[PDB]
Motif scaffolding. Structure first.
Motif, short mmCIF file in Angstrom:
data_model
loop_
_atom_site.label_atom_id
_atom_site.label_comp_id
_atom_site.label_asym_id
_atom_site.label_seq_id
_atom_site.Cartn_x
_atom_site.Cartn_y
_atom_site.Cartn_z
N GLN A 45 6.15 12.08 26.64
CA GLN A 45 7.28 11.20 26.69
C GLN A 45 7.80 10.78 25.21
OE1 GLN A 45 5.70 7.47 28.37
NE2 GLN A 45 6.26 8.34 30.83
N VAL A 103 -0.59 11.65 27.49
CA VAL A 103 0.09 10.57 28.17
C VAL A 103 1.31 10.41 27.28
CG1 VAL A 103 0.62 8.66 29.60
CG2 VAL A 103 -1.72 9.86 29.64
N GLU A 104 1.46 10.29 25.83
CA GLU A 104 2.34 9.97 25.05
C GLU A 104 3.26 11.04 24.40
OE1 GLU A 104 0.90 7.47 21.83
OE2 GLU A 104 1.49 5.63 22.96
N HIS A 123 11.57 5.28 21.45
CA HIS A 123 11.52 6.47 22.41
C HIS A 123 11.66 5.75 23.84
CE1 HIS A 123 9.93 9.16 19.85
NE2 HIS A 123 9.36 8.43 19.10
N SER A 124 12.76 5.11 24.14
CA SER A 124 13.11 4.16 25.46
C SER A 124 14.30 4.93 25.91
CB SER A 124 13.28 2.83 25.26
OG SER A 124 13.33 2.34 26.36
N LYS A 162 -5.11 7.49 18.29
CA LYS A 162 -5.44 7.25 19.50
C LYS A 162 -6.56 8.11 19.99
CE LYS A 162 -2.30 3.69 20.86
NZ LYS A 162 -1.28 3.02 21.72
N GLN A 194 13.23 -0.14 21.05
CA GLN A 194 12.06 0.51 21.25
C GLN A 194 12.38 2.04 21.18
OE1 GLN A 194 8.65 -1.12 22.41
NE2 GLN A 194 10.16 -2.24 21.04
N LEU A 250 4.67 7.07 20.18
CA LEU A 250 5.65 6.75 21.41
C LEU A 250 5.96 5.12 21.32
CD1 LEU A 250 6.81 7.00 24.23
CD2 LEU A 250 4.59 6.82 25.17
N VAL A 275 -5.15 9.49 25.83
CA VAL A 275 -3.96 8.89 25.52
C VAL A 275 -2.76 9.36 24.92
CG1 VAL A 275 -2.99 6.59 24.70
CG2 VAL A 275 -5.34 6.64 25.92
#
Lengths: 119, 115, 122, 53, 211
Positions: free
Chosen positions: B14, B10-11, B78-79, B3, B76, B56, B7
Motif C-alpha cells: 500500500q 502489509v505496508e 498514502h491515502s 517495523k 495522510q 505508509l 508489518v
RNA sequence: UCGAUGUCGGCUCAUCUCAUCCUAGGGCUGAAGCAGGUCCUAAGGGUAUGGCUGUUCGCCAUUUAAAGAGGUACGCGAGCUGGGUUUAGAACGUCGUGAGACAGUUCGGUCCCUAUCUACCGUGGGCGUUGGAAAUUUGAGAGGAUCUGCUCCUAGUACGAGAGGACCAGAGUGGACGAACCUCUGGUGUUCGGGUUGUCACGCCAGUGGCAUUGCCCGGUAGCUACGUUCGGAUGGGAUAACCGCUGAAAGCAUCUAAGCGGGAAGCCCACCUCAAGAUUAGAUUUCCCUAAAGAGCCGUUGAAGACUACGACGUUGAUAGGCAGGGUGUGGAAGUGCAGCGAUGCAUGUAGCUAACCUGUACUAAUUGCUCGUUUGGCUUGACC
RNA sequence: AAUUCCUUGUCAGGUAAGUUCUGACCUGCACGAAUGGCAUAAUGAUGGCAGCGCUGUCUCCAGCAGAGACUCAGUGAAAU
RNA sequence: CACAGGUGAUCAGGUAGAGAAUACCAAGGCGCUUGAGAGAACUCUGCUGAAGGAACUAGGCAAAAUGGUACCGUAACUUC
C-alpha cells in the motif's frame, strides 16, 4: 514504568552523570585498566566504545568531535594515535568487564574494565 | 524500515507514488469528495507547515487562510483521499516544522522562495 | 471540543458577536461538543439593533473547532477559532449569511442552509 | 501507629523465618586451581584461564 | 471452536479504496502442530492440543521431548489447548496441521493475550479514582485512596475494595474483531483492532463467541 | 464513654435497604391515540452541571430516560479540607454602675501519629496433595459485567371531529461507563538535532565544552499516554414474580387450582470475560526418570516482566545483553576549504553532519557442561483380573 | 448598616441563574453627633463584590527530572 | 548534638551590570562523615502539556502571568 528505555540514573543529575562517564572514559583510555562498580562498568561500554569506533578513521572533524565529547587533548591524541589503529579490524567489543567481587566500604559489586588486546 | 519484517509487507503493498516536497512549499492537494453519489476533486492549496515521514504512516499538514479564519489539515500522504499533489512554490525555510506561522497573519506570514 | 463556559465566535448574520457555551446537549453527563453538535449558549456580545440581544439564551451548532474534527482516512482538520451558528427554538438556522468556512459534518437535513451559504465547505 | 499489646517471642520469630544469609556460589579456577566466586576473577586476578595483571 | 496461536508483530493501517483507514494489527501465524487430541473417553472432554514456534533441544525437557515425539512434531515454544466439540474434531489427527486458513476475510474472531504490565499502580490509574485537590490546602494525599470504609459499622474493609496493586500483565480477551486479510504462505493474519499485549507476545485467535 | 468516643458542611471512597426516580413486566382507569393517574411485581444497572449561600437544604438557570427516599458513629479528619460552630485580639447593636455578656453580628485565628493485630488490595516463601518430574488441563466455586437516548422504516398507518399520533416488528447512530491498544490525531519526551544571551575555560583564531531551571528558545525518536483508536454490555436457554390463562371439581352452576396442562420481567440460575484442585473431596490426561536419575535451583546475559520476588528468554550445540554493520527516524544544511562581500553574513562542496530507547543482522565483549538440591520402583486391607 | 431579629425586607442594576455585592426605599427589634455624626484625596501584605490578562485551580489528568519510598552492606531510634 | 537557627565590626578582584542585586570566574577555600543499586505505588521539589479557561473553591488558595531603558500617551477624583 520503564518499558524499552535505556540509560542509567545512578542517583545523579544528567549533568553529573555525563561528566562522571567522561572522566571514566578518559581514565580508561589512559591506564587501560580501571576498577569500578559493575553497573558503572556496563554503562561505560555505551560511552567509551563509540569513541573508539569513530577514531577508526582519523580526520579533523572526527578528531574535533571526540574532543567535544571527551574534552581531554591528551586522551584524544591517544584515542586517535593508538586506540584507533589497534581496533581497526575489530567489530566492536573493545573492552571487557571482569567481575571482581564487592567493595569494602559499602558492599558495592565491583568489576574491572579492561581494553581488549593488551590493556 | 522501522517495523517488524512482516508489518513492512502489509505496508509496502500500500504505497501511492507522489512528488517530493519539503516543508515551506506551497502545494495543491486534490481531495476526493463524495456529495451523495458523485465523486469530484476539491483542491486544498496552502503551505506545508509540517510533515512526518513514517512510510505508509506518513502525513503532512497544510495551512491556508480560508475567508478570514486559518485552516490546517493533516493529510495522510498514502491515502486514496489524496488524488494528487503538485508543488507550486518551493519554500526556503530553516526548520522542519513551521509552527510559528500560526501566530503570523499577513506580510509576516510569508516565506522566501527556493531557487 | 467545546465545553461549558467556553467562548465561541459567531459565524452567521444574526447580530451576535461572541457566545458562551452553557450546556452541551444530548446526554446526561455529556462533556464535549464538536462540529455538528447542538449546544445551549448565552450571547455575550451583540451588534447594535440586531436580531439577537446581549444576554439571550438560545441554541447554537458548532461549525468549526480549534481541536479539529477527524476524517475516516485518519486526517485531522483544525481551525483557528471555535465558531457557532445560532439556531431556532426547533434547532434550525436563523442565518441568511454564513461567515468563514464550515466542515462537511453539517451535511444532513437540518444544517443544509448552513452548508449552502458557507463560503467554503471542507 | 503502635501496637496495643507486645508481640510474643513466638510471633516475633515467625517473622524471622525468612531471614537467611546468602551463600555465594564458588568454583575452582582451571589454571591456578584456586577457589573463587562463580563468574568472578580469582583474588590474584585469574578468570577463565586469563591474567589481568 | 478451535483457534490458533500467533505472535503480535505490531500495528499498521489498511486503506480502503473509498478512502478509509482501517487500524489493523499483524499476527504472525507459524505452523500449529497438533501435539495431542483429547476426547471424552480418555480425558472426559474434547479438545485439541497444539504447539507453535521452536525450542532448541537443550531447552526441551525429556518429558516434553517424549510428548512431542509421540505426536511426531517439532518442539514449539509453548503448548496451547483449544476446547472443541465433535464437529471440530473432524480432520484433526495427531501430528496434524493448523494454518491461518482456519479464518476467512470478514470473520469476527476473539483474540486473547497477556496485557502490557504496568507493575504496581495506584488507585487513580488502576481504578480511575478521582484525584484530590492539587491546591486548596490539600496535604500529602493528592493521589490517595480516600476513605476505605464506614465507621464502627461494619468496622472493616469489604472484600473487593479497589486499591493499588499489580496492573496489567493479565489475560485479556477482545471480542468482535474482524479479519481484514489472511495469507497462509507467509503466515499472515491481519485483524482489525488493538490485540492486548506488546509486539512479540503470544496471542490466541479464536472464532468469536458472541456470533 | 468525662485517667478524651473530635462538631456541621465539602472532597475522596463507598456499602446496604426498598417505602422505585428512570428503564422492565402487569391490573384498573373519568385508558381513543399520544401522553398520563393510581396500585402490584421488580434493587440488574443507571440515577447532571452550574449561580447564591459555610451551609446540609432551599430557590433559580440549563439539561436528563431519570436527576429516588433512606441506613451505614445524622458512613468516611490515625484518608484530605477547615468555610460555619466553639478559646485567647478587636469592633458595632443591645444588656449591665462594672468587671463582663449575647442560639446577635463582624474582621482574624497551629487539624500530630513511621501501622503491631484484625480487615482489605497486591505479591512471594514453606509444606501438603500415597515415588518423583515437565507440561497441558476439568471445573466445586468466586468475581466482573448488566445503563440508556435519538433518528429512519413499519406509517402519517391503527386511533382520532380535528390537533395530533402509536403498540408490536426491523435498520442505524450516539451519550455515560469499562477494557485493551499506540496504526492514526496529539501530549510528554532533562544521554536526539539545532538557534541563541551572559560568563569561564580548552595556548590563540576557528571550533567546542562547563555553568546560569534542561540557562532560555524551536523542533523531536522510542516508550508511556488521552482528549486518539478499537472493542463490550448478550435479545439466547431454564425456572419464576405480579398478572393473564386451559380444562376442572369441592359447590349439578361458576371458578387459573384442589388433581393436571400453559403464558409471563432489565429480577433468579446458566450463557460472556477473568480467576479458580490449600475443591486437605487436594481432581484428570500425555510423556520422562529412578545405585543422587528425570528435573529444579544457585550463578551469569537479561526482558514492553518487575518494589524485592515471581514470570519470560538465553548461557558457546549461543543473537541473551552491550558493541558493531546496514537501514529507518529526527534535526535541518557539520567541520574544513573555496567563492562574493569593507563587514556582519550569504553561497557551494552537500539534504550535509549528528542522530537516545526503533528495525534487520552480525560472536567483537560478556553469558565457565561449575556446584547444590532432588534417588534406588514407591506402605497396608479388600475386590476384580492375572 | 462592622448596627436590621423578622430577613434571602422591598424595588433597581449586574449574571443564563446572585442568601454575597452596588443603588435606593425607611417599616432604625436595637444609628446619631468628641465611648463623636456624615463624607473625604492619598495611603493599607485591611474586609466585601466585579472584570481583563493568565493559567493543571478544574473538566481529567498525562509525560518527564531530581530527593525519598523499594533492594543490598554498615550503624541503629520512637511512642505503646 | 560535629544541630539547615542566631552572632557586632573590618577588607572588598574580573566580565556584564545602576549596584554590596544577579550570572559566570580570580585569590583563597571547599564537595556540607553512610554508601551501592533499582528506576513500583505513593510523598516532596520542579519542568512541559491537546481543547477549554475559574466551570475549581469558603475564597483564583496555589500556580500561571507582568516585569528593563528611552520615547509617546494616560481617566474619575483631589487636600492641587
Amino acid at each position: 514504568m520503564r518499558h524499552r528505555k535505556s540509560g542509567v540514573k545512578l542517583g545523579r543529575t544528567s549533568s553529573h552523570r555525563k561528566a562522571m562517564f567522561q572522566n571514566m572514559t578518559n581514565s580508561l583510555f589512559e591506564h587501560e585498566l580501571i576498577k569500578t562498580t559493575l553497573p558503572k562498568a556496563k554503562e561505560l561500554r555505551r560511552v567509551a566504545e563509540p569513541l573508539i569506533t569513530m577514531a577508526k578513521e582519523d580526520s579533523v572533524a572526527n578528531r574535533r568531535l571526540a574532543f567535544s565529547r571527551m574534552r581531554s587533548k591528551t586522551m584524544v591524541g591517544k584515542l586517535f594515535g593508538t586506540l584507533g589503529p589497534r581496533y581497526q579490524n575489530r567489530p566492536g567489543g573493545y573492552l571487557r568487564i571482569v567481575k571482581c567481587g564487592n567493595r569494602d566500604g559499602d558492599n558495592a559489586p565491583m568489576a574491572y574494565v579492561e581494553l581488549v588486546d593488551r590493556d | 524500515s522501522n517495523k517488524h519484517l512482516l508489518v513492512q509487507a502489509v505496508e509496502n503493498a500500500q504505497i501511492i507514488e507522489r512528488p517530493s516536497f519539503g516543508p515551506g512549499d506551497t502545494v495543491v492537494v486534490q481531495v476526493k469528495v463524495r456529495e451523495g453519489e458523485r465523486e469530484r476533486l476539491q483542491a486544498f492549496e496552502g503551505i506545508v507547515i509540517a510533515k512526518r515521514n513514517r512510510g505508509l504512516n506518513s502525513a503532512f499538514t497544510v495551512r491556508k487562510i480560508s475567508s478570514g479564519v486559518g485552516v490546517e489539515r493533516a493529510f495522510q500522504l498514502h491515502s486514496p483521499i489524496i488524488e494528487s499533489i503538485e508543488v507550486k512554490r518551493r519554500g526556503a525555510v530553516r526548520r522542519a516544522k513551521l509552527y510559528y506561522l500560526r501566530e503570523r497573519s499577513g506580510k509576516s506570514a510569508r516565506i522566501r522562495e527556493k531557487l | 471540543m467545546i465545553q461549558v463556559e467556553s467562548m465561541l465566535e459567531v459565524a452567521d448574520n444574526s447580530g451576535a458577536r461572541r457566545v458562551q457555551c452553557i450546556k452541551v446537549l444530548g446526554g446526561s453527563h455529556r462533556r464535549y461538543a464538536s462540529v455538528g453538535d447542538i449546544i445551549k449558549v448565552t450571547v455575550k456580545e451583540a451588534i447594535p439593533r440586531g436580531r439577537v440581544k446581549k444576554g439571550d439564551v438560545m441554541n447554537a451548532v458548532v461549525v468549526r473547532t480549534k481541536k479539529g474534527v477527524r476524517r475516516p482516512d485518519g486526517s485531522v482538520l483544525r481551525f483557528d477559532d471555535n465558531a457557532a451558528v445560532l439556531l431556532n427554538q426547533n434547532k434550525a438556522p436563523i442565518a441568511t449569511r454564513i461567515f468563514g468556512p464550515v466542515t462537511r459534518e453539517l451535511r444532513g437535513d437540518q444544517f443544509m442552509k448552513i452548508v449552502s451559504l458557507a463560503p467554503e465547505v471542507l | 501507629a503502635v501496637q496495643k499489646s507486645r508481640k510474643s517471642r513466638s510471633r516475633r520469630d515467625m517473622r524471622r523465618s525468612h531471614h537467611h544469609m546468602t551463600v555465594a556460589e564458588l568454583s575452582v579456577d582451571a589454571t591456578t586451581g584456586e577457589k573463587h566466586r562463580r563468574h568472578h576473577m580469582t583474588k590474584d586476578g585469574f578468570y577463565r584461564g586469563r591474567q589481568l595483571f | 471452536a478451535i483457534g490458533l496461536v500467533g505472535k503480535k508483530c505490531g500495528m499498521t493501517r489498511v486503506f480502503t479504496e473509498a478512502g478509509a483507514s482501517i487500524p489493523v494489527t499483524v499476527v504472525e501465524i507459524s505452523a500449529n502442530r497438533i501435539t495431542q487430541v483429547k476426547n471424552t473417553d480418555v480425558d472426559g472432554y474434547q479438545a485439541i492440543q497444539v504447539t507453535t514456534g521452536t525450542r532448541r533441544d537443550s531447552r526441551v525437557t525429556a518429558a516434553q521431548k517424549g510428548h512431542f515425539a509421540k505426536a511426531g512434531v517439532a518442539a514449539g515454544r509453548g503448548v496451547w489447548e483449544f476446547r472443541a466439540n465433535d464437529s471440530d474434531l473432524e480432520g484433526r489427527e495427531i501430528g496434524g496441521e493448523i494454518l491461518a486458513d482456519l479464518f476467512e476475510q470478514g470473520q469476527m474472531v476473539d483474540v486473547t493475550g497477556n496485557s502490557k504490565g504496568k507493575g504496581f499502580q495506584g488507585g487513580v490509574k488502576r481504578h480511575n479514582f478521582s484525584m484530590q485537590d492539587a491546591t486548596h490546602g490539600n496535604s500529602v494525599s493528592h493521589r490517595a485512596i480516600g476513605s476505605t470504609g464506614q465507621n464502627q459499622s461494619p468496622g472493616k474493609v469489604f472484600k473487593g475494595k479497589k486499591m493499588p496493586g499489580q496492573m496489567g500483565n493479565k489475560r485479556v480477551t477482545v471480542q468482535g474483531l474482524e479479519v481484514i486479510s489472511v495469507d497462509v504462505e507467509k503466515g499472515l493474519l491481519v485483524i482489525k483492532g488493538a490485540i492486548p499485549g506488546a509486539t512479540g507476545g503470544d496471542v490466541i485467535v479464536r472464532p468469536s463467541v458472541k456470533a
